[PDB]
Design a protein around this ligand. Structure first.
Ligand SMILES: Nc1ncnc2c1ncn2[C@@H]1O[C@H](COP(=O)(O)OP(=O)(O)OP(=O)(O)O)[C@@H](O)[C@H]1O
Ligand SMILES: Nc1ncnc2c1ncn2[C@@H]1O[C@H](COP(=O)(O)OP(=O)(O)OP(=O)(O)O)[C@@H](O)[C@H]1O
Ligand SMILES: Nc1ncnc2c1ncn2[C@@H]1O[C@H](COP(=O)(O)OP(=O)(O)OP(=O)(O)O)[C@@H](O)[C@H]1O
Lengths: 91, 93, 97
C-alpha cells in the first residue's frame, strides 16, 4: 500500500477526479490548501494498492498539467498498515 | 514513532475523541475534508503521532469508536516516521 | 526525499515562512487545523507540508525549530516522513534521491 499526496490547481480538480474515476481509483480524500512553488490549491490524499500507484500518478499528471508554473507535485509515501473501519479489519 | 491518519464520519468524531482520551491519547491534529469512496462527502481527518508500543491500542480505539457497519466508515493509515521533533525544546523524538 | 509536516502557532507562521525562504526552501503547502497536545479543548494551528531533497532536511527542520519556538506549551511538532518518489506535474520529472 502507498499513500499518494497530490497538490493541483482548483480549476483542474474536476478534470483530475474524472480521470481518477476512469482509472478505477475511487477512494480518496481532499481538502483546500494554500501553497508556494500563497496560492489556493487542492490537496488529494489517495491510498492505493501497489498496482494502482502508476495508474493514479499518471491520471493526475495528465489531467492536472497546464504547462504553466504552479501545476503542482505528487508525493508517493510508504504505508505500513491500512485498516477498513467498517469491518475493523486490517489489510 | 508512527503517524496515524484516520478518516471518519463527522457524526462519529466526538465518540472517537472520547475513546482516544480513555485510551490515554492526548496529542492529535484534526481537520475537515471531503471524500469519495462524482459525489464528495464530508469527513474528518485525524492525524496522530504515536510511539510504536502504542500504535495498536490507538488504532483499536479509533476502529471501535468510528464504526457504524455501513459503507462510508472510512480508513486508518499507519505511516512510518523518520524523525520527530518537539518545537518547544527542539529535542529529537 | 522526505515530506516534512510541521504544526505551529498561527502567530508564528510569518516568522517561519521567512526563515524557510531565507534557507532557500520555497516549495510548501499549508492549511489551518485544530489540535490538542499531550499536555493542556482544541486550539487552532497551521500545518505546513514541505517536500524536500535529503540535503535540505536538516536546514528546513532547523529553520522551523528556530522560528516557531516560544518555550510555551502549544509550540507544536515536526514530523519528517519518508517519501518513495516525487513527481513534478508540469515537467513530468521524478525524484527519488
Ligand atoms: N516542495 C513542496 N512541498 C510541498 N508542497 C509543494 C512543494 N512544491 C510545490 N508544492 C505545492 O504545489 C504547488 C505548485 O507548485 P509547483 O510544483 O507547481 O511549483 P513551480 O514553482 O510551478 O514548480 P517547481 O517548484 O517544481 O519549480 C505549490 O503552490 C504548493 O501548493
Ligand atoms: N483509499 C483511500 N484513500 C484515501 N481516502 C480514502 C480511501 N478510501 C476511503 N477514503 C476516505 O474514507 C471515506 C469513506 O470511505 P468508505 O468508508 O466509503 O470506503 P469504501 O472502501 O469506499 O467503503 P468501506 O471501506 O466502508 O467498505 C472516503 O470518503 C474518503 O474520505
Ligand atoms: N502526537 C501528536 N500527533 C499529532 N499532532 C500533535 C501531536 N502532538 C502535538 N500535536 C499538534 O501540535 C499542537 C501543539 O502541541 P504541544 O506543542 O501542545 O505538544 P505537547 O507535547 O502537548 O506540548 P509541548 O510539545 O509544547 O511540550 C497540538 O495542538 C497538535 O495540533
Amino acid at each position: 500500500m502507498k499513500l499518494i499526496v497530490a497538490i493541483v490547481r482548483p480549476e483542474k480538480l474536476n478534470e483530475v477526479l474524472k480521470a481518477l474515476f476512469q482509472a478505477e481509483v475511487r477512494g480518496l480524500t481532499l481538502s483546500r490548501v494554500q501553497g508556494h512553488g500563497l496560492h489556493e490549491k487542492v490537496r488529494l490524499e489517495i491510498g492505493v494498492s501497489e498496482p494502482f500507484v502508476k495508474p493514479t500518478v499518471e491520471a493526475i499528471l495528465k489531467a492536472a498539467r497546464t504547462g504553466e508554473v504552479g501545476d503542482g507535485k505528487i508525493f508517493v509515501l510508504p504505508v505500513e498498515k491500512v485498516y477498513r473501519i467498517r469491518t475493523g479489519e486490517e489489510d
